[PDB]
Design a protein. Structure first.
Lengths: 70, 117, 151, 150, 67
RNA sequence: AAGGCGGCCCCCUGGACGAAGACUGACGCUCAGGUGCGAAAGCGUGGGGAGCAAACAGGAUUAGAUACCCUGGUAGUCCACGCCGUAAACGAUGUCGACUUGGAGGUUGUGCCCUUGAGGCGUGGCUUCCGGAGCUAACGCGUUAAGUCGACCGCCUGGGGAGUACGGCCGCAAGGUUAAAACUCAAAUGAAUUGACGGGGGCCCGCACAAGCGGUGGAGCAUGUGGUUUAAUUCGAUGCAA
């Protein structure tokens, strides 16, 4: 991403904008999974393990609204 | 030598080392510095402080050219991705553009196997 | 204490002139329950410093403390046996306390005819940023600001 | 360099506390075999009688029978030359519950053979587990710290 | 949000449209996921094909950097 | 159908689902023997080979490491034509038909109402999570049942021996398939519970750390301890907790 800083802009805010752009692009987070070979078996296992937790959280959110006042 | 008004600083960072190099506008290196040569050995050169030391050494190594308008290009998931840039800024060099071009294979060559540590 | 979080205790108003700063200076300068002679020494030194600097005693003490006032504490929050310290900003109360502790410690460090004379001589240097307090502040600040990549 | 048959198994099998650089006393045909001649230092321990802490377990192969008068005994108890000042540790801290001192290695010191001795004790297969666990755990802690701090 | 294609009754999506299609690509040339766009699974699979057609025909860059 | 399939385009083509219809008229289900497909690995011929990577070499750890950590690295992984029918080929749940409370979704089509906004009511196919009766040894299934029945095939009869040998067939081979007997034992197992353990995790607490402030290891001396000497150096206390 091009983060060419214009005039009258502090280096601090310029670097923060660059870091935010990198974070929203998610380039740094992709190397931690592209650094090694994940077998298709392992990838599918991770995907289902993440899907199971992803609606289990919503299931618990919608189920904890019945009892347990505080 | 012949002084250049504009420059591009490439910061190739990695998990174990960080290299910073300078070119004018086309990819012709002028000065380079590494954390290994910055007085650090082993994993001790992987700290962002070592990256800052390497960046300031590279800035000192390019004093004879006097670059005023610099554009920084980061590459690699290293701790120095911000330390090198801030060191370059603090060394008196003005930054004009900031970019992070990192090689992202589109499901290309197969990476090595998982390490069972 | 993990759960019991207490506040800050109150000290005597230092009825010599009346100042919490002076009371804290006295109760940190005193040792072995010798508050009487500690007060005599510190008051003699401050009265000499008043004429030596031309200003009031309290104002001259406050500005001398401010001129050697530090800003960063270098604590040891390392995760284990590995050496990993951390500098942090200091709250104003602990800042003043540490500054006056450094002053009274330099008083013991530099020797002379009497502790009153040592205190007077060291305050006459902290007035124009000399002695030991400012040197210690600089020596702590250089190593507290040279390590910025470590958070 | 000048190293000869050593017993590194006993280092893992025991807790070496202190070491002695005392020498060994051996007869003919054996010191020559130390150069070449297949000396083996397995099952080595001291056999204190009164002040005579002989090394009992050692098999040095005799390479010749050209002197066919003296009977060859590869399992001979070899005498040991140690200062009486430092021999107090051996008549002292040996017979408490299981303390032993074993021959860790044997080397050369200016054409004279020196056998390194060491005071140690057994592990009962539970100290070995703890040692291996700690050796692995320090490595794992260093690795995880390095990975976390990138 | 809501599927604007269904809201406006857009039956088909053509790669030739760029002004109203740039809204579905990030600044890095990546496709905005459905969980952020608010688009149905019927039209996400057609938006992806249109974006791929535009990338092939140099109408929308694959990424910010190419050379 | 299963195995399994992921930029885009072009050509051929199989299969699946829906409103409203028209049409033959039991043409329907299963199926030993047989036929075909069928992960990867493997084999033969002809190609290619960027990266990865059995075997192999070197380096490192360890008492030892013919391994896990690292640098290289051939077969192979990439293509065409041939051989095997092997997987935890799993949903450990065979194929087809009917019935049995409900809730919250995903995907796909259609009908209607004023569609001003994915406004509202219906209606079929696939699929996901809870959950009632019921079932089960219990975990658990629960309209896609492991609930009640109907039609058929295959398989099971203690754990080892053993899916082994022989025998027949298949295959260039590796091996696959069909499949025992002698001998040993009184056990071999699965679901769940209580403790215990983990180099599993989370939370909490105590001058436990941090923060401070004083001390002990440096030096006279004091009793006390172990060892030594001695006639005895009188008994016990021997990590915190002597
Ligand atoms: Mg293959
Ligand atoms: Mg390898
Ligand atoms: Mg090796
Ligand atoms: Mg099966
Ligand atoms: Mg059939
Ligand atoms: Mg259920
Ligand atoms: Mg067989």
């Amino acid at each position: 991403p091009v983060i060419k800083v214009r005039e009258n802009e502090p280096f601090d805010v310029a670097l923060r904008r660059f870091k935010r752009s990198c974070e929203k692009a998610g380039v740094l987070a992709e190397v931690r999974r592209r650094e090694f070979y994940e077998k298709p078996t392992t990838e599918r296992k991770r995907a289902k393990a993440s899907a199971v937790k992803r609606h289990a959280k919503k299931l618990a959110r919608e189920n904890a609204r019945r009892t347990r006042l505080y | 030598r012949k002084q250049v008004s504009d420059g591009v600083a490439h910061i190739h960072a990695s998990f174990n080392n960080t290299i910073v190099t300078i070119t004018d506008r086309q990819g012709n290196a002028l000065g380079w510095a590494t954390a290994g040569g910055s007085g650090f050995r082993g994993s001790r050169k992987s700290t962002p402080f070592a990256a800052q030391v390497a960046a300031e050494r590279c800035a000192d190594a390019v004093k004879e050219y006097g670059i005023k308008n610099l554009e920084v290009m980061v590459k690699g998931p290293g701790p120095g991705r911000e330390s090198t840039i801030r060191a370059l800024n603090a060394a008196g060099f003005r930054i004009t553009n900031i970019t992070d071009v990192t090689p992202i294979p589109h499901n290309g060559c197969r990476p090595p196997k998982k390490r069972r540590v | 204490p993990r759960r019991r979080v207490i506040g800050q205790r109150k000290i005597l108003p230092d009825p010599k002139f009346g100042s919490e700063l002076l009371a804290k200076f006295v109760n940190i300068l005193m040792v072995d329950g010798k508050k009487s002679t500690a007060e005599s020494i510190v008051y003699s030194a401050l009265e000499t410093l008043a004429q030596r600097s031309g200003k009031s005693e309290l104002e001259a003490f406050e500005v001398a403390l401010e001129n050697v006032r530090p800003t960063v504490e270098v604590k040891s929050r390392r995760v284990g046996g590995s050496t990993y310290q951390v500098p942090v900003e200091v709250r104003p109360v602990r800042r003043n306390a540490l500054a006056m502790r450094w002053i009274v410690e330099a008083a013991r460090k530099r020797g002379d005819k009497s502790m009153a004379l040592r205190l007077a001589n060291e305050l006459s240097d902290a007035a124009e940023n000399k002695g030991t307090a400012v040197k210690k502040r600089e020596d702590v600040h250089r190593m507290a600001e040279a390590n910025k990549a470590f958070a | 360099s000048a190293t000869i048959a050593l017993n590194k198994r006993a280092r893992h099998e025991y807790f070496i506390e202190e070491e002695f650089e005392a020498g060994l006393a051996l007869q003919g045909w054996e010191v020559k075999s130390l150069r070449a001649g297949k000396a083996n230092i397995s099952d080595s321990y001291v056999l204190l009688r009164d002040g005579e802490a002989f090394l009992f377990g050692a098999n040095i192969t005799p390479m010749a029978v050209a002197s066919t008068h003296v009977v060859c005994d590869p399992t001979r108890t070899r005498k040991l030359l140690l200062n009486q000042r430092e021999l107090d540790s051996l008549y002292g801290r040996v017979n408490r519950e299981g303390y032993t001192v074993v021959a860790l290695s044997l080397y050369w010191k200016n054409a004279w053979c020196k056998v390194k001795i060491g005071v140690a004790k057994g592990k009962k297969q539970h100290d070995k587990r703890s040692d291996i666990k700690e050796r692995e755990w320090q490595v794992d802690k260093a690795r995880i710290m390095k990975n976390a701090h990138r | 949000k809501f599927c604007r294609f269904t809201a406006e009754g857009v039956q088909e999506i053509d790669y030739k449209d760029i002004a109203t299609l740039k809204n579905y690509i990030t600044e890095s040339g990546k496709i905005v996921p459905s969980r952020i766009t608010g688009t149905r699974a019927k039209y996400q699979r057609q938006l992806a094909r249109a974006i791929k057609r535009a990338r092939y025909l140099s109408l929308l860059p694959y990424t910010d950097r190419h050379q």
